[PDB]
Amino acid sequence: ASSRVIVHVDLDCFYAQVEMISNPELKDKPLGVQQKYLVVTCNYEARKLGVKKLMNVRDAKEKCPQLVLVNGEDLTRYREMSYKVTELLEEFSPVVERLGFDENFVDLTEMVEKRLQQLQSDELSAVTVSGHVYNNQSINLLDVLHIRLLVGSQIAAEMREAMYNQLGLTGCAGVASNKLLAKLVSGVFKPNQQTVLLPESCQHLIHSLNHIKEIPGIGYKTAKCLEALGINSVRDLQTFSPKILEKELGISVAQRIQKLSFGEDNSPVILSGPPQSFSEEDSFKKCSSEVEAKNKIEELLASLLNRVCQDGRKPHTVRLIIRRYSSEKHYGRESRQCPIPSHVIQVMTPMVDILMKLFRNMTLLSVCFCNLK
DNA sequence: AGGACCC
DNA sequence: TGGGTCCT
Ligand SMILES: [Mg+2]
Ligand SMILES: [Mg+2]
């Protein structure tokens, strides 16, 4: 149970794909999916015309005045298609980890070993790659790690084919020996293509990044820290004193991220299974006057009740989240949480009242059910 | 409850 | 600055 073969599957412009399937007439039009004042994503036609992920509508339309916009505030259809993709990949191999609605990791190691035991000491020399090899690296058919990663690429090509044939969806895949690398390599050829990373090109991929922030695992706060410390490139992080890093970020963060900077990442692909929470949100200018807007809270409620029904399991906890007024101090939302009574688990209106009291304990309103059982 | 990370 | 995860 040593060396792994992991695939990362990463769909193209996922919300825009879902909307193009729904309304074919948007098919070869540049398309942006809007949420409030943002174009959260857009199809590849629009990316050619300058439209970028998460651009304001204004910038978006004065870069491209012919841009078609559809509202993507209601996530229902995205969410449903997102689970269809996960279940299809689960069928290839059951340990599938979701990351957001349109990325999945699959640990292919058992699958690859089983396919390999199937082949003769004849056809092992006909093993070929499917799709791109990162950095155009030469394959060595006598290297058992090259052979396993190639079989990995063939399984990823089957997955992408099946997603297209069964669900109508295109996507990228990256095959590598761990989740970090699979995730960095999946993005090298886009849209709708795949890439496999052989071990000798690992430093090349890692040093191809232009800032430590691009490392999956290193976010906004951590990047700001490393900066303050004079750490900008992936090589700065590789060569920095482990000790000062430790005595500044904590042992956990320091040792994990410095391993990341080498391309090293032991984290297991984790079975996501069914979701741990269910929530819906609503943004607005500053429209929750702090009074008559429980009305919002009932709408949110009605949808969530229909969803959390549908699941089979039921939530034992409810939470209310808010965002307070005026100026924008970069970190700060607030939440009141209490258990749901069992009278009420097993007829909207008692739920309506719990929510209102937690409101009374305390631009954004959301309800979240959790602690599913 | 809130932080930090992800898409 | 419309969702989700897991750690502190
Ligand atoms: Mg992605
Ligand atoms: Mg994507």
A231 CA to B5 C1', in Å?
20
A108 CA to B2 C1', in Å?
37
Determine if strand C comes within 7 Å of the CB of A97.
no
Decide: residue A106, CB within 10 A, 0-12 exposed, 13-18 middle, 19+ buried. buried
A219 CA to B4 C1', in Å?
8
Prior bond to A350 cis, omega within 30? no
What is the domain partition of chain A in residue ranges? 1-12+75-197, 13-74, 198-274, 275-373
Active site residues of A: 103
Q: What is the CA(A97)–ligand 1 centre distance, in A? A: 14
Burial A288-314 (b: 16+ CB within 10 A, else e): beeeeeeebbeebbeebbeebeeeeee
Q: Is A307 annotated as a binding residue?
A: no
Give the residue with minimal CA–C1' separation from B7: A100
Determine if strand B comes within 7 Å of the CB of A216.
yes
Q: Is A360 annotated as a binding residue?
A: no
Determine if strand B comes within 7 Å of the CB of A168.
no
A13-74 against A275-373: fold identical: no
Token pair 């209601």: residue: A74
A109/A293 Cα distance (integer angstroms): 52
Experimental resolution (Å): 2.2
8 Å CB contact between A57 and A33: no
A340/A370 Cα distance (integer angstroms): 10
**Kind of pairing between the strands at A194-196 and A132-133:** parallel
Determine if strand C comes within 7 Å of the CB of A79.
yes
CA angle A231, A235, A239 (to 5 degrees): 80
Return the structure tokens found at A107.
């640990």
Write out the CATH class of domain A1-12+75-197. alpha beta
Determine if strand C comes within 7 Å of the CB of A283.
yes
Burial A193-212 (b: 16+ CB within 10 A, else e): bbbbbbbebbeebbeeeeeb
Taking each helix axis from N to C terminus, what angle separates A251-261 and A242-249, rounded to the nearest 10 degrees? 130
| Protein fold of A13-74 | MutS, DNA mismatch repair protein, domain I (3.40.1170)
Determine if strand C comes within 7 Å of the CB of A310.
no
Q: Is A83 annotated as a binding residue?
A: no
Residue A195, beta-bridge partner list: A132, A174
Distance (Å) of CA A309 to CA A54, A150, A305, A314: 33, 43, 6, 7
8 Å CB contact between A365 and A321: yes
CATH number of the A275-373 domain: 3.30.1490.100
The phi and psi torsions of A361 (rounded to 5 degrees) equal -65, -40
DSSP string of A256-279? HHHHHHTT---PPP----S-SEEE
The residues, any chain, with a CB within 8 Å of residue A188's CB and separated by 6 or more, are A132, A134, A174, A195, A205
Q: What is the CA(A364)–ligand 1 centre distance, in A? A: 26
Q: Is A15 annotated as a binding residue?
A: yes
Q: Is A311 annotated as a binding residue?
A: no
Q: Provide the positions of strand B that have an atom within 7 A of a protein CB.
A: 1-7
* Ligand sitting nearest the alpha carbon of A216: 1
Determine if strand C comes within 7 Å of the CB of A282.
yes
Q: How was this structure determined?
A: X-ray
8 Å CB contact between A212 and A171: no
CA angle A26, A28, A31 (to 5 degrees): 50
A257/A180 Cα distance (integer angstroms): 11
Architecture of the structural domain at A198-274: Orthogonal Bundle (1.10)
Q: What is the CA(A191)–ligand 2 centre distance, in A? A: 9
Q: What is the CA(A296)–ligand 1 centre distance, in A? A: 31
8 Å CB contact between A68 and A77: no
Nucleotide nearest to A370 (CA to C1'): C4
The phi and psi torsions of A158 (rounded to 5 degrees) equal -60, -40
A252 CA to C8 C1', in Å?
13
